[PDB]
Each structure stands twice: as C-alpha cells, then as structure tokens.
Amino acid sequence: KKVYTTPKKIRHKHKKVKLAVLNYYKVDDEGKVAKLRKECPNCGPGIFLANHGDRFYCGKCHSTFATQK
Amino acid sequence: AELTIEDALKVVLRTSLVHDGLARGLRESAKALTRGEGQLAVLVESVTEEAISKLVQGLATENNVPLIKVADAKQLGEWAGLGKIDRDGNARKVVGASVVVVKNWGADTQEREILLEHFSQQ
Ligand SMILES: [Mg+2]
Ligand SMILES: [Zn+2]
C-alpha cells in the first residue's frame, strides 16, 4: 500500500469547558430567589435563553430562538 | 426506635430510583422546581459555599415546600444510588450526590410520606 503523507491538522471536539453551573441566578436578602437571563418562551422556567450580542438561542430547543430583545 | 429512623426517606429514594424520578444535582433540582415537575426537596448540610444551599432553600420556598435536610450529601449518595454496585454490603466508591429533588414519588401509601407531609403542612 501507498506511503502515508498526511497534510497536517490533528483536530479535536468541544470538551465542554465546565464553567460555574449555577451562575444564571441570584439570591439576596434571605428567602428571595431572583432570576438571571430570559426564560425560554418555548418551554417555561428552568430553561433560560442564552444572551449574547442580539443572539438568543436555547439548549433543549438546542438553537431554535433568534429574535431581537 | 421501632418506627422510622430517617430510613423512610431512603425507602422513598429507592422507590424513585426504581421508577426513574430522582433529580440529582442543583441545576436538575431547579429545573424540577420551576416547572413544577419535582415536588420533594433534599437540602445540603456540609455546604462550604453555602450560596448553593441558600439558592435551594429559596427555590423550595418559591413554589411548594415539602423540604427536608437529612444528613450531608455523601450519605445520600451512598444510600439512594451513587457509587458502582460493589457486592451486597456497601463498600462502593464513596461519592456525594449534592442535591436531590423527587419526581414520580414511587410506591403507594406507607410511612414513606406521612412524616414529609407533617413537616410541610403546618
Ligand atoms: Mg494518509
Ligand atoms: Zn429550550
């Protein structure tokens, strides 16, 4: 068989990068539990849309939300 | 004690495991709560961050509170279903479960839930 040449690139996948987990919430003056980031209109509170620079995609819907806010 | 020595909770957990209903972790618990999917709440005791615990408490308060605290998280992990099988008499890989929220309930009646009810409705 032919001599293996290979033209570079030994790529990999997204290994997740585990950040903080519960950073999309705030708890203040004893008992209160206030929400950070807009909750998903497709499926209610628990799943909250990712807020970027006019980019509003989901996780359970995986991608299906794009409208401006 | 002839009656319940914290092991009603254990039984409940087991039942949940059998019928697939244990929301394990903080995020999962939150998810269970905010939609109204999960009912029961097991709170962390050995919380060196404490913030997480507070959050959990808040969540419990927010919708419905049949809250319980038990004894740490490692114990819970050992009991309910964490650490690979290992023989008949424990000796598993000792791992903590952090937070537990119960869906489905599991089995019917028993001394499983009466205590919980008492704790809740006052
Ligand atoms: Mg080649
Ligand atoms: Zn979604």
CATH number at residue B4: 3.30.1330.30
This PDB structure is determined at a resolution in Å of: 3.5
Per DSSP, the three-state class of A25 is strand
- Whether the CB-CB separation of B24 and B18 falls below 8 Å is answered with no
Q: Smallest Cβ distance to B34: which of A21, A27, A46?
A: A46
Angle between helices B51-62 and B26-35 (to 10 degrees): 20
Query: DSSP letters along B37-73, please?
Result: ----EEPPSS-SS-HHHHHHHHHHHHS---EE--S-S
Give the type of residue at A45: P
DSSP strand pairing (A34-35 vs A25-26): antiparallel
Quick check: A46 contacting B, CB < 8 Å?
Answer: yes
Q: Which of B96, B51, B45, B49 is nearest to B71 (CA)?
A: B45
- Whether the CB-CB separation of B26 and B55 falls below 8 Å is answered with yes
- Whether the CB-CB separation of A65 and A42 falls below 8 Å is answered with yes
Per DSSP, the three-state class of B107 is coil
- Whether the CB-CB separation of B56 and A51 falls below 8 Å is answered with no
For B54, residues 6+ apart whose C-beta sits below 8 A from its C-beta are: A27
Q: How buried is B37 (Cβ within 10 angstroms: 0-12 exposed, 13-18 middle, 19+ buried)?
A: middle
3-state helix, strand, coil in chain B (%, to 5): 40, 10, 50
How many structural domains does chain B have? 1
Domain that holds residue B81: 1-122
User: In 10 A of CB A9, how many CB atoms?
Assistant: 5
- Whether the CB-CB separation of B80 and B72 falls below 8 Å is answered with no
- Whether the CB-CB separation of A50 and A58 falls below 8 Å is answered with yes
Quick check: A27 contacting B, CB < 8 Å?
Answer: yes
Calpha distance B22→B81 (Å, rounded): 10
Q: Smallest Cβ distance to B35: which of A27, A33, A46?
A: A46
- Whether the CB-CB separation of B71 and B50 falls below 8 Å is answered with no
List the beta bridge partners of residue A26. A34
Identify the residue whose tokens are 């203040």: A28
Give the type of residue at B99: V
Quick check: B26 contacting A, CB < 8 Å?
Answer: yes
Topology, domain A1-69 = N-terminal domain of TfIIb (6.20.50)
- Whether the CB-CB separation of B86 and A53 falls below 8 Å is answered with no
- For chain A, domain boundaries: 1-69
User: In 10 A of CB B21, how many CB atoms?
Assistant: 21
Q: How far is A4 from chain B (nearest CA, A)?
A: 44
Calpha distance B103→A35 (Å, rounded): 23
Q: Which phi and psi (to 5°) does residue B33 adopt?
A: -65, -60
Quick check: A28 contacting B, CB < 8 Å?
Answer: no
Query: B-chain residues within 8 Å CB-CB of A22?
Result: 26-27, 30, 52, 55
- Distance (Å) of CA B117 to CA B21, B65, B72: 19, 10, 22
Distance B29 CA to ligand 2 centre (A): 17
